[PDB]
Each structure stands twice: as C-alpha cells, then as structure tokens.
Coordinates of C-alpha atoms and ligand atoms in Angstrom, one line a residue:
Chain A
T211 CA -40.2 -91.0 -35.3
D212 CA -39.8 -87.3 -35.1
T213 CA -38.6 -86.9 -39.4
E214 CA -41.6 -88.9 -40.3
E215 CA -44.1 -86.9 -38.4
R216 CA -42.6 -83.7 -39.4
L217 CA -42.9 -84.8 -43.1
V218 CA -46.4 -86.1 -42.6
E219 CA -47.1 -82.7 -40.6
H220 CA -45.8 -80.9 -44.0
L221 CA -47.8 -82.8 -47.0
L222 CA -51.1 -82.9 -45.2
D223 CA -50.9 -78.8 -44.1
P224 CA -54.2 -77.3 -45.4
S225 CA -52.7 -74.5 -45.7
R226 CA -50.5 -76.0 -48.8
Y227 CA -52.8 -78.5 -49.7
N228 CA -56.2 -78.3 -50.7
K229 CA -57.9 -82.5 -51.1
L230 CA -60.6 -80.9 -52.9
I231 CA -58.5 -79.8 -55.9
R232 CA -57.5 -82.0 -58.8
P233 CA -53.6 -82.8 -58.6
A234 CA -53.4 -81.2 -62.6
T235 CA -51.0 -79.1 -63.6
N236 CA -50.4 -77.0 -67.2
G237 CA -54.0 -76.3 -66.9
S238 CA -56.0 -79.0 -69.0
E239 CA -53.8 -81.8 -68.5
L240 CA -55.6 -85.0 -67.1
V241 CA -55.0 -87.3 -64.4
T242 CA -54.7 -90.8 -65.3
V243 CA -56.2 -93.4 -62.7
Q244 CA -54.8 -97.2 -63.0
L245 CA -57.7 -99.6 -61.8
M246 CA -57.3 -103.5 -60.9
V247 CA -60.1 -105.3 -59.0
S248 CA -59.2 -108.5 -57.0
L249 CA -61.7 -110.7 -56.2
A250 CA -61.5 -112.1 -52.5
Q251 CA -64.8 -114.2 -52.7
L252 CA -68.3 -114.6 -54.5
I253 CA -70.6 -114.6 -51.4
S254 CA -73.9 -114.8 -53.1
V255 CA -76.2 -114.5 -56.7
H256 CA -79.7 -113.7 -55.4
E257 CA -81.7 -114.6 -58.5
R258 CA -84.7 -113.3 -57.2
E259 CA -83.7 -109.7 -56.6
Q260 CA -80.9 -110.1 -59.2
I261 CA -78.2 -109.1 -57.1
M262 CA -74.4 -110.6 -56.9
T263 CA -72.6 -109.8 -53.6
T264 CA -68.7 -109.9 -53.9
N265 CA -65.9 -109.0 -51.6
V266 CA -63.0 -107.5 -53.8
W267 CA -59.9 -105.4 -53.3
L268 CA -60.2 -102.4 -55.7
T269 CA -56.9 -101.1 -56.4
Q270 CA -56.3 -97.5 -57.4
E271 CA -52.8 -95.9 -58.7
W272 CA -52.1 -92.4 -59.4
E273 CA -50.0 -89.5 -59.4
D274 CA -50.0 -86.6 -57.1
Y275 CA -47.4 -83.8 -58.0
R276 CA -48.1 -81.9 -54.6
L277 CA -47.5 -85.1 -52.5
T278 CA -43.8 -85.2 -53.3
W279 CA -40.3 -84.6 -51.3
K280 CA -36.7 -85.0 -50.9
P281 CA -35.8 -88.2 -49.4
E282 CA -32.4 -86.7 -48.6
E283 CA -34.1 -84.1 -46.5
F284 CA -36.1 -86.6 -44.6
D285 CA -33.6 -88.9 -43.5
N286 CA -34.1 -91.3 -46.8
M287 CA -37.3 -91.7 -46.6
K288 CA -39.1 -93.5 -49.5
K289 CA -42.6 -93.6 -49.0
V290 CA -45.3 -93.3 -46.2
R291 CA -48.8 -94.0 -45.3
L292 CA -51.4 -91.4 -45.5
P293 CA -54.9 -91.5 -44.2
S294 CA -57.2 -91.8 -47.8
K295 CA -59.7 -88.9 -46.0
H296 CA -57.1 -86.3 -45.9
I297 CA -55.9 -86.2 -49.5
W298 CA -57.5 -86.1 -53.0
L299 CA -58.9 -89.1 -54.2
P300 CA -60.8 -89.6 -57.5
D301 CA -64.4 -91.0 -56.7
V302 CA -64.3 -94.4 -58.3
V303 CA -67.7 -95.8 -57.2
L304 CA -69.6 -98.9 -58.3
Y305 CA -72.0 -97.2 -60.6
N306 CA -73.9 -100.0 -61.2
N307 CA -75.0 -100.8 -57.8
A308 CA -78.2 -102.2 -56.0
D309 CA -79.1 -100.6 -52.5
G310 CA -77.3 -97.4 -53.5
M311 CA -74.0 -97.9 -51.7
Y312 CA -71.3 -96.3 -54.1
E313 CA -68.2 -96.0 -51.8
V314 CA -65.7 -98.3 -50.7
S315 CA -66.3 -99.8 -47.3
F316 CA -63.2 -99.2 -44.9
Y317 CA -60.3 -96.5 -46.4
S318 CA -57.8 -97.8 -45.6
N319 CA -54.5 -95.7 -45.8
Chain B
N236 CA -65.4 -110.0 -43.9
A237 CA -69.2 -111.3 -45.4
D238 CA -72.0 -108.5 -44.8
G239 CA -70.3 -106.7 -41.8
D240 CA -67.6 -104.2 -41.2
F241 CA -63.6 -104.8 -42.0
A242 CA -62.5 -102.6 -38.8
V243 CA -63.9 -101.7 -35.5
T244 CA -66.4 -99.0 -35.0
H245 CA -67.5 -98.4 -31.7
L246 CA -64.0 -96.6 -30.8
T247 CA -64.2 -96.7 -27.1
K248 CA -61.2 -95.2 -25.0
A249 CA -57.7 -96.5 -24.3
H250 CA -56.2 -96.8 -21.6
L251 CA -52.7 -95.5 -21.8
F252 CA -49.8 -96.3 -18.7
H253 CA -47.0 -94.0 -18.2
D254 CA -43.8 -96.1 -19.3
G255 CA -46.1 -96.1 -23.0
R256 CA -48.2 -99.0 -22.9
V257 CA -51.4 -98.6 -24.6
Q258 CA -54.6 -100.9 -24.0
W259 CA -57.3 -100.8 -26.4
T260 CA -60.3 -103.3 -25.7
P261 CA -63.2 -102.0 -28.2
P262 CA -66.3 -104.3 -29.0
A263 CA -67.2 -105.3 -32.4
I264 CA -70.1 -107.3 -34.0
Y265 CA -68.5 -109.3 -37.1
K266 CA -69.9 -111.6 -39.8
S267 CA -67.4 -113.5 -41.7
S268 CA -68.2 -116.0 -44.2
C269 CA -67.3 -120.1 -43.5
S270 CA -67.8 -123.2 -45.6
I271 CA -70.6 -125.1 -43.8
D272 CA -70.8 -128.7 -43.9
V273 CA -73.9 -130.5 -43.4
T274 CA -72.9 -134.2 -44.3
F275 CA -73.8 -135.4 -40.5
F276 CA -76.7 -132.7 -39.7
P277 CA -77.8 -132.2 -37.2
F278 CA -74.9 -134.0 -35.5
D279 CA -72.5 -132.0 -37.4
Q280 CA -69.7 -130.2 -36.5
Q281 CA -68.7 -126.7 -37.6
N282 CA -65.1 -125.1 -38.4
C283 CA -65.5 -121.5 -39.0
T284 CA -62.8 -119.3 -39.1
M285 CA -61.5 -115.3 -38.8
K286 CA -58.5 -113.8 -40.4
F287 CA -57.1 -110.6 -38.7
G288 CA -54.3 -108.3 -40.0
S289 CA -52.9 -105.4 -40.6
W290 CA -54.2 -104.0 -43.9
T291 CA -51.5 -101.5 -45.0
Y292 CA -48.4 -101.9 -42.8
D293 CA -46.2 -105.1 -43.4
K294 CA -44.3 -107.1 -40.9
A295 CA -41.4 -104.8 -41.2
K296 CA -43.6 -102.0 -39.6
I297 CA -46.2 -103.8 -37.7
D298 CA -45.7 -107.3 -36.2
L299 CA -48.7 -109.4 -34.2
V300 CA -48.1 -111.3 -31.2
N301 CA -50.7 -114.1 -30.1
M302 CA -51.9 -112.7 -26.1
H303 CA -52.8 -115.8 -25.7
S304 CA -53.3 -119.3 -28.0
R305 CA -57.1 -119.8 -26.8
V306 CA -60.1 -117.6 -27.1
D307 CA -60.8 -116.1 -23.9
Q308 CA -64.3 -117.1 -22.5
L309 CA -64.7 -115.8 -19.0
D310 CA -67.3 -113.5 -20.3
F311 CA -69.2 -115.8 -22.8
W312 CA -72.8 -115.9 -22.9
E313 CA -74.1 -119.6 -23.7
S314 CA -76.4 -119.8 -26.7
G315 CA -77.9 -122.9 -26.1
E316 CA -77.9 -124.0 -29.6
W317 CA -74.2 -124.2 -30.3
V318 CA -71.1 -125.2 -27.9
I319 CA -67.5 -124.2 -28.7
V320 CA -65.0 -127.2 -28.9
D321 CA -61.9 -125.5 -29.7
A322 CA -61.0 -121.7 -30.6
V323 CA -57.5 -121.0 -31.1
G324 CA -55.5 -118.3 -33.1
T325 CA -52.4 -119.3 -35.2
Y326 CA -49.8 -116.5 -36.6
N327 CA -49.4 -116.9 -40.3
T328 CA -47.2 -114.6 -42.7
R329 CA -47.6 -114.9 -46.3
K330 CA -47.0 -112.8 -49.5
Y331 CA -49.6 -111.0 -51.9
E332 CA -49.7 -110.4 -55.6
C333 CA -50.5 -106.6 -54.2
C334 CA -47.4 -105.6 -52.6
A335 CA -43.7 -106.8 -52.0
Chain C
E172 CA -53.2 -80.4 -6.1
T173 CA -56.0 -82.4 -7.1
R174 CA -55.5 -85.3 -9.5
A175 CA -57.8 -83.6 -12.2
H176 CA -55.6 -80.6 -12.2
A177 CA -52.6 -82.9 -12.5
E178 CA -54.4 -85.0 -15.5
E179 CA -55.1 -81.8 -17.4
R180 CA -51.5 -80.8 -16.9
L181 CA -50.4 -84.4 -18.4
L182 CA -52.8 -84.3 -21.2
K183 CA -51.8 -80.4 -22.4
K184 CA -47.9 -82.1 -22.3
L185 CA -48.8 -85.2 -23.9
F186 CA -50.7 -84.2 -27.1
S187 CA -48.4 -80.7 -27.5
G188 CA -46.6 -82.1 -30.5
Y189 CA -48.3 -85.3 -31.2
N190 CA -49.4 -86.7 -35.0
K191 CA -52.2 -89.5 -34.9
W192 CA -51.0 -90.4 -38.4
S193 CA -47.4 -91.2 -37.8
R194 CA -46.2 -95.0 -36.3
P195 CA -45.1 -94.1 -33.1
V196 CA -41.5 -95.8 -32.9
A197 CA -38.2 -93.7 -32.0
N198 CA -36.3 -95.6 -34.6
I199 CA -37.8 -96.0 -38.7
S200 CA -36.0 -99.6 -38.2
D201 CA -38.4 -100.3 -35.1
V202 CA -41.6 -102.1 -35.4
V203 CA -44.4 -102.0 -33.6
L204 CA -45.2 -105.2 -31.4
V205 CA -49.2 -105.5 -31.1
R206 CA -50.4 -107.9 -28.8
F207 CA -53.2 -109.0 -30.2
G208 CA -56.3 -111.7 -28.5
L209 CA -59.9 -112.4 -29.0
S210 CA -62.8 -112.7 -26.4
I211 CA -66.0 -114.0 -27.1
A212 CA -69.0 -112.4 -25.8
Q213 CA -71.7 -114.3 -27.8
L214 CA -72.3 -116.3 -30.7
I215 CA -74.9 -114.5 -32.2
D216 CA -76.0 -116.6 -35.2
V217 CA -74.6 -119.6 -37.4
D218 CA -76.5 -119.0 -40.4
Chain D
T265 CA -81.1 -64.3 -18.7
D266 CA -77.9 -62.8 -19.2
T267 CA -77.2 -64.0 -15.4
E268 CA -78.0 -67.4 -16.4
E269 CA -75.8 -67.4 -19.7
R270 CA -73.2 -66.0 -17.9
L271 CA -73.2 -69.1 -15.5
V272 CA -73.0 -71.6 -18.4
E273 CA -70.3 -69.7 -20.0
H274 CA -68.4 -69.8 -17.0
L275 CA -69.1 -73.4 -16.0
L276 CA -68.4 -74.7 -19.3
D277 CA -65.6 -72.5 -20.1
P278 CA -62.6 -75.0 -22.0
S279 CA -60.2 -73.1 -21.2
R280 CA -60.7 -74.6 -17.4
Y281 CA -63.1 -77.1 -17.5
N282 CA -61.9 -80.5 -19.3
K283 CA -65.1 -83.1 -19.9
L284 CA -62.2 -86.3 -20.6
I285 CA -61.1 -86.1 -16.8
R286 CA -63.0 -87.6 -14.0
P287 CA -63.8 -85.1 -11.2
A288 CA -61.4 -86.9 -9.0
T289 CA -60.3 -85.3 -5.8
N290 CA -58.2 -86.3 -2.6
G291 CA -55.5 -88.0 -5.2
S292 CA -57.0 -91.7 -5.1
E293 CA -60.2 -91.2 -4.5
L294 CA -62.8 -92.6 -6.6
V295 CA -66.3 -91.3 -8.3
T296 CA -69.5 -92.4 -6.7
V297 CA -72.2 -93.0 -9.3
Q298 CA -75.6 -93.7 -7.7
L299 CA -78.3 -95.9 -10.7
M300 CA -81.7 -96.4 -10.8
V301 CA -83.3 -98.1 -13.3
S302 CA -87.1 -97.2 -14.2
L303 CA -89.2 -98.9 -16.0
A304 CA -91.9 -97.3 -18.5
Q305 CA -92.7 -99.8 -20.9
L306 CA -91.9 -104.0 -21.5
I307 CA -92.2 -103.6 -25.2
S308 CA -92.1 -107.0 -26.1
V309 CA -90.6 -110.4 -25.4
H310 CA -89.0 -112.3 -28.5
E311 CA -88.9 -116.1 -27.6
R312 CA -87.8 -117.1 -31.3
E313 CA -84.5 -114.5 -31.0
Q314 CA -84.2 -114.3 -27.6
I315 CA -84.4 -110.6 -26.9
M316 CA -86.3 -108.3 -24.3
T317 CA -87.2 -105.1 -25.8
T318 CA -87.9 -102.3 -22.8
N319 CA -88.4 -98.4 -22.7
Chain E
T27 CA -54.0 -76.1 -60.4
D28 CA -52.7 -73.2 -57.9
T29 CA -54.7 -70.9 -59.6
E30 CA -58.0 -73.7 -59.0
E31 CA -57.2 -73.1 -55.4
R32 CA -56.8 -69.3 -55.4
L33 CA -60.0 -69.1 -57.2
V34 CA -62.0 -71.3 -54.4
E35 CA -60.2 -70.0 -51.6
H36 CA -61.3 -66.5 -53.5
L37 CA -65.2 -67.3 -53.9
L38 CA -65.7 -69.1 -50.7
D39 CA -63.7 -66.2 -48.0
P40 CA -66.5 -66.2 -45.5
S41 CA -65.8 -62.0 -45.3
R42 CA -67.3 -61.8 -49.0
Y43 CA -70.2 -64.8 -48.9
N44 CA -71.9 -66.9 -46.3
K45 CA -73.9 -69.4 -47.5
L46 CA -77.1 -68.7 -45.0
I47 CA -78.3 -65.7 -46.6
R48 CA -80.4 -66.5 -49.8
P49 CA -78.9 -64.6 -53.2
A50 CA -81.3 -62.2 -53.5
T51 CA -80.7 -58.7 -55.1
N52 CA -83.2 -56.0 -56.1
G53 CA -85.2 -56.1 -53.0
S54 CA -87.7 -58.6 -52.8
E55 CA -86.3 -60.6 -55.9
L56 CA -86.8 -64.6 -55.5
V57 CA -84.4 -67.2 -56.9
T58 CA -85.9 -69.3 -59.6
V59 CA -84.6 -72.7 -59.2
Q60 CA -84.9 -75.3 -62.3
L61 CA -85.4 -78.8 -61.4
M62 CA -85.5 -81.9 -63.5
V63 CA -85.6 -85.4 -62.7
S64 CA -83.5 -88.4 -64.2
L65 CA -84.7 -91.6 -63.6
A66 CA -81.6 -94.2 -63.2
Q67 CA -83.8 -97.0 -62.2
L68 CA -87.2 -98.2 -60.4
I69 CA -85.5 -100.6 -58.1
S70 CA -89.1 -101.9 -57.3
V71 CA -92.9 -101.4 -56.3
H72 CA -93.9 -103.0 -53.1
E73 CA -97.6 -103.2 -53.6
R74 CA -98.5 -104.5 -50.1
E75 CA -97.1 -101.5 -48.4
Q76 CA -97.3 -99.2 -51.3
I77 CA -94.0 -98.3 -51.5
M78 CA -91.8 -97.3 -54.6
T79 CA -88.1 -97.3 -54.6
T80 CA -86.2 -95.5 -57.5
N81 CA -82.6 -94.2 -58.2
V82 CA -82.6 -90.6 -59.3
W83 CA -80.7 -87.4 -60.0
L84 CA -82.1 -84.5 -58.8
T85 CA -80.9 -81.9 -61.1
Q86 CA -81.1 -78.4 -59.5
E87 CA -80.0 -75.1 -61.5
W88 CA -80.0 -71.8 -59.8
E89 CA -78.4 -68.5 -60.3
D90 CA -76.2 -66.8 -57.4
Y91 CA -74.6 -63.5 -58.4
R92 CA -72.2 -63.8 -55.7
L93 CA -70.2 -66.7 -57.3
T94 CA -68.9 -64.6 -60.4
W95 CA -65.1 -64.3 -61.4
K96 CA -63.8 -62.7 -64.5
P97 CA -61.8 -65.8 -66.6
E98 CA -59.0 -63.8 -68.0
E99 CA -57.9 -63.0 -64.1
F100 CA -57.7 -67.0 -63.4
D101 CA -55.8 -68.3 -66.3
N102 CA -59.2 -68.2 -68.3
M103 CA -60.9 -71.0 -66.0
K104 CA -64.8 -71.3 -67.1
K105 CA -66.0 -73.5 -64.5
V106 CA -65.0 -74.7 -60.8
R107 CA -66.3 -77.6 -58.9
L108 CA -67.4 -76.1 -55.3
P109 CA -68.7 -78.6 -52.2
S110 CA -72.6 -78.1 -51.9
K111 CA -71.9 -78.0 -48.4
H112 CA -70.5 -74.9 -48.5
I113 CA -72.6 -72.5 -51.0
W114 CA -76.3 -71.8 -50.6
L115 CA -78.5 -74.4 -51.5
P116 CA -82.6 -74.6 -52.3
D117 CA -83.7 -77.4 -49.7
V118 CA -85.7 -79.1 -52.1
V119 CA -86.7 -82.6 -50.9
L120 CA -89.1 -85.1 -51.8
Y121 CA -93.0 -84.9 -49.2
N122 CA -94.7 -87.9 -50.4
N123 CA -91.7 -89.9 -48.9
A124 CA -92.4 -92.6 -47.0
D125 CA -89.7 -94.1 -44.2
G126 CA -88.9 -90.5 -43.5
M127 CA -86.3 -89.6 -45.5
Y128 CA -86.5 -86.3 -47.3
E129 CA -83.2 -85.0 -48.5
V130 CA -80.6 -86.4 -51.2
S131 CA -77.8 -89.2 -50.8
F132 CA -74.6 -87.6 -51.0
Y133 CA -74.7 -84.3 -51.8
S134 CA -71.9 -84.1 -54.3
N135 CA -70.1 -81.2 -55.6
Chain F
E10 CA -78.4 -50.9 -49.5
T11 CA -79.3 -54.5 -51.1
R12 CA -81.1 -57.2 -49.0
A13 CA -77.9 -59.3 -48.8
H14 CA -75.4 -57.1 -46.7
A15 CA -78.7 -55.9 -44.3
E16 CA -79.0 -59.4 -43.7
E17 CA -75.3 -60.3 -43.0
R18 CA -75.4 -57.3 -40.6
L19 CA -78.2 -58.7 -39.0
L20 CA -76.9 -62.1 -38.5
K21 CA -73.7 -60.7 -37.0
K22 CA -75.8 -58.8 -34.5
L23 CA -77.9 -61.1 -33.4
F24 CA -75.0 -63.9 -32.9
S25 CA -72.5 -61.5 -31.5
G26 CA -73.1 -62.2 -27.7
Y27 CA -76.0 -65.2 -28.2
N28 CA -75.5 -68.5 -26.1
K29 CA -78.0 -71.3 -27.1
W30 CA -77.8 -73.2 -24.1
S31 CA -79.7 -70.5 -21.5
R32 CA -83.4 -70.4 -21.6
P33 CA -84.1 -67.7 -23.2
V34 CA -85.9 -65.3 -21.0
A35 CA -85.0 -61.7 -19.8
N36 CA -86.3 -62.2 -16.0
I37 CA -85.8 -65.6 -14.4
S38 CA -89.4 -66.0 -13.1
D39 CA -90.2 -65.8 -16.8
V40 CA -91.9 -69.1 -18.5
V41 CA -91.3 -69.5 -21.7
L42 CA -94.7 -70.7 -23.2
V43 CA -94.4 -73.0 -26.3
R44 CA -97.0 -73.0 -29.0
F45 CA -97.3 -77.0 -29.7
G46 CA -99.3 -78.6 -32.7
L47 CA -98.9 -81.4 -35.0
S48 CA -99.7 -81.8 -38.5
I49 CA -99.9 -85.7 -39.7
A50 CA -98.8 -86.3 -43.1
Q51 CA -99.4 -90.0 -43.7
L52 CA -100.2 -93.1 -41.3
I53 CA -97.7 -95.4 -42.6
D54 CA -98.8 -98.5 -40.7
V55 CA -100.6 -99.8 -37.7
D56 CA -98.7 -103.3 -36.8
Ligands
LIG93 C1 -60.5 -126.0 -38.7 O1 -60.0 -125.6 -39.6 C2 -58.6 -125.1 -39.5 C3 -58.1 -124.4 -40.9 O2 -58.9 -125.0 -42.2 C4 -57.9 -126.3 -39.2 O3 -56.7 -125.8 -38.5 C5 -58.3 -127.2 -38.1 O4 -57.5 -128.1 -37.6 C6 -59.6 -127.5 -38.0 N1 -60.3 -128.5 -37.1 C7 -60.7 -129.3 -37.2 C8 -61.1 -129.9 -35.9 O5 -61.1 -130.2 -38.3
LIG94 C1 -51.1 -101.7 -49.1 C2 -52.7 -102.1 -49.1 O1 -53.4 -101.8 -49.0 O2 -52.8 -104.0 -48.9 C3 -54.1 -103.9 -48.9 C4 -54.0 -105.2 -49.2 N1 -53.1 -106.3 -48.0 C5 -53.9 -106.4 -46.8 C6 -53.6 -107.9 -48.8 C7 -51.8 -106.2 -48.5

C-alpha cells in the first residue's frame, strides 16, 4: 500500500532515526524490556560434553518513542512490520552458551 | 528446525513477470526433528514431518496455498537406503498464545 | 533497440519508488496469496 | 597505466553498464556459453557417504 | 536522547575523524594500549591435537585525543558508546592460534 | 603541523584518482616484479 510504504520510509529514515542509540528520554531514564521464553522442543541433553540444546521462542517487548505515528494521518493504520535489523534492539543474549553463539537464529520482523 | 537454519539463506534470483507474478525457487538444506519408531527395525517405516509457515504475518495478511498436494519428485536423487512411500502437504490454521 | 537497453529502462522504472519492507498489496484489507510447494532433491540422511 | 585505468573505468561505469542484465541483442536472441571442465586432482572418493571431491 | 545522537554524529563526522589514521600527536609519539584478559571459561583441552579452547574477554584501553568533548555542551554526558568498526583500533590478536582464527568474535561497542 | 593532518592530506592525495582494478605500471610493457616469500608459523597437521 502507498500509505504503508510512506509510513515505513518515514519511520526508518536514517536521517531522523539512528538505530544505534537507546530510545531513552529525559536523560538518565531506563528502558524496560519484558522477557518471556517459550520452549518449543528439548532437542537433546549431551552429558559427555554437558550441553543442553533447545528450540525456544524468545519474546521481547519494549517501548521506542521514536517509532510512533498518528493513525489518523496514515489511513487509521495501527501497527506495521519492521525488519529487526533496522531498528534499535536490546542485545539480550544467552550468556551461558556453549559454542559461543550469543544471538538468536533468525532475526524476524 | 533442529540443528539447521530456520529460513532460506541461499537467495537465488526471482523470476518476475509483467503482470506482477513473482516466482522464487531457492534451494535449501533443512535439518528437522522427527520422532523415530524402531519397533520393527530394520523393517521399520518412519513418518517425519516438516511444518512451514510465515513467522510474523497472520492469515489476514498472508495466506498459503498448496501448489500441489504431493511433494514433487521429478528431480529426486535416489538414496539407496530409504524409499519415499508418501509425501503430502496438509494446510492447517491455529492460534498461539503469543498472538491474537 | 537492444533488449538489454530496454531491460535497463524497465529496471530504472520498476525500482524508482519501491519499498521492499512493505507488504505488496494495493488495499490494506487485501491478502497476499503465496502458492507454496516442495520439491525434494535428495534425502541426505535419516539420523 | 593511465590509459588502462581510463579503459577500465569506462567499461565498468555503472551509469551505462548494468551487470544484472543479460548481454542479449536482436530481441529474443540468447547468450551462448561455452563450458569446459579441466580436472586438476581427484582428491578423494568417500564410499561410505557416497561423495566425490575434486579440484 | 537527541543530545546523544548529536554527540555521536559530531564525534564520527568524517571531515574531522577518519579511522585509518593512528591517533599520535607530538610527531613520533606512540599509542599506549593496555591489555587485560579475563577468562570466561576453559572450554576444553584436546591433548591429542594439542589445542586449548577458551572463552575470554580481551579488554583493551587506549587514549584517542580526537574523540574529546565538553560535557556541559552535551547535557553533561560523561561517556558514550561508539561502534568499534567506526573508530581506530589496535589490531591486537592471538599469534599462537590453531585453526587460523586471529581476531575477536563480535566487535562489540 | 601535526602528523595527523599531514597523513590526512596524504591519504586524500593518494586515492583521489586511484583505480585498484588496473595493473600499477607506468608503461604497458613493464612487468610488476613481486617478491614472494613464506614464513611458516606451525605445521598444524600431516594427515
Ligand atoms: C504420518 O503422520 C501424519 C501426522 O501425524 C499423519 O497425518 C499421517 O497419517 C501419518 N502417516 C502414517 C502412514 O502413519
Ligand atoms: C509475531 C511473531 O513473531 O510470531 C512468532 C511466533 N508464531 C510464528 C507462532 C506466530
């Protein structure tokens, strides 16, 4: 849709939006990240090397005041999908991983 | 997925037609989990499944259509260890607690 | 006149105002029908 | 050389050479590609996993 | 914050900072790099091929005189995060490595 | 006067009209003499 692509261009414009900066206002306020793990499958437990392999969906929820818009100006659009590689993310990682793979596997919208 | 990639990673070229049709046929190696029943091994029959779907678009935004029920085997390289008895895709819908 | 030059013009026009991050529907209430099929090249391994 | 770099800049100029487009002429004519495999080394045949490796 | 965006854009402004130049003043002065390895875990010792695998943090500290600012001109900010790809780095790596892997894993901020 | 400003000027001047795809010889008939050598750090394996 023309409205949708106008909105997406507006939101992700690198001129006005810098994805390397934490979306904090008022100076020293903090960003709250809600975390919830959903276990899809316990793939294996390797006793010899002491590794547990899991297929999980890691829910992450937070606020970004720079990614707001007025629905009335954009055809009453309430939500949109944005590529997670082009917005600010809190770098929440599996800290006690084995094999040094900290990040998620897919990087969905 | 189990010990592999979740999405396609090769990213071949798409074939775009003038009326707006887009045909994209990339290769993929998948490592999927399937429960294995060895009651009658080595005369056993295994039934391993593969579930595909859009991750972030619900039915109102993206819907899937079976191109054809049976999996295509016109270019299949015979294994010599296993023979495919039946390979069919089933369309399903459902709700998750994640999303409304 | 050469097919390559015409294709160059077509590529210049097609991607002029194109957004790869937006669902490609004329109307928001429209749904993108994706025809999906599988073709198996080989059965590498049953572990 | 100055002449060589002038030529290479002219040939690959993205303003007038798009590498995404088949070098097709005469409309529906096709590009002919000649192929020839030269074998330098038969590195190994792995019978167990049924793979041949070559250079 | 907008002040942090302004500061980040001011520090990495290419007209006044390029990472290809060592930050040495006074002619032939040298940059002093402080190294400290912290051990996350000793993953394994493979005696057969004589290889030790470790997870570590390669702490590195140095002074770059080109990345200075006055806090009172930026809402009293005392420190900021810059991507390590965009600043001059000392290319400190492991020489006795096996498998030919020299550099650090992620190139964090 | 500082070394950094001189180095910045030099970098600007060296790559103003530099083409990395062209063999760097003043004359076409010239040969590029490459001095080649090896330094072994370790013999990892003999399989
Ligand atoms: C294989 O499993 C699927 C899903 O559980 C089921 O629909 C199908 O009938 C099974 N086939 C056989 C031969 O058991
Ligand atoms: C919105 C979103 O990311 O959903 C992911 C989970 N899924 C595929 C079960 C809906």
